[model samples]
Target: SMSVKKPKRDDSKDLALCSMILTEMETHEDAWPFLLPVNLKLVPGYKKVIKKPMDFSTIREKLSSGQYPNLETFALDVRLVFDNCETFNEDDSDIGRAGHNMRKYFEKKWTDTFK
Candidate 1:
């Protein structure tokens, strides 16, 4: 009965994987728009449009500070970066397209990294 169950997933390993994926995302050329918080000065209504603004630097800090309890939680923030991008930016725009590319890259890497 014990063998039939799945193997225990290591928490540290999960965080490490999240960290690695974040590094890949941060280093990506398309990561420019997501490096820091969105500029409200440029987009006057940005805060009005996006209530929760997430960014790579924030994720990096959270990852380093052990704010994420699990991989699933870590993944939520990662996905939020792109989800918000799509919500705020147009599909044909540069930042929007970058978000799509980065999302695709992250998902592919996430899938391939795991079983």
Candidate 2:
């Protein structure tokens, strides 16, 4: 006699969510604020200090220094920017080329190192 077991599934919900957010970021400048607030709920006394309108160097500094309590949220914002860049203006800016090449390099690195 054999016992039956349920099949396990990797939902991959977070990755999907991250990807969706990235796609959105590529088109919207008012995106980060939706993820993080001037007064963050997860992190006390957390406030975004914008340097040049959309830029969040202050928040990045905080995240790097481990000041912000929620890293997942921060990662989501970054992922959004990355995903969005692919859809952003390519001819008007060199960002598309840079992003594409960077992705290729990493993909090659992964294949070379892991395989």
Per-residue error for 60 in candidate 2, Å, reads 1.5
TM-score of each model, paired residue for residue: 0.89, 0.31
What lDDT does each candidate get?
Answer: 0.91, 0.42
Superposed by TM-score, candidate 2 places the C-alpha of residue 79 at a distance from the truth, in angstroms, of 1.2
In candidate 2, stretches whose alpha carbon ends up further than 4 angstroms from where it belongs are 1-59, 62-67, 91-93, 101-115
Per the 3 Å backbone cut-off, how many clashing residue pairs does candidate 2 have? Answer: 2
Highest-lDDT candidate = 1
Location of the lowest summed lDDT over 10 successive residues in candidate 1:
3-12
Instruction: For candidate 2, write residues 12-101 as lDDT tens digits.
Output: 453444344334433344333323323345544233323222124443444556554443655544544334445443634565654454
Clashing pairs in 1: none
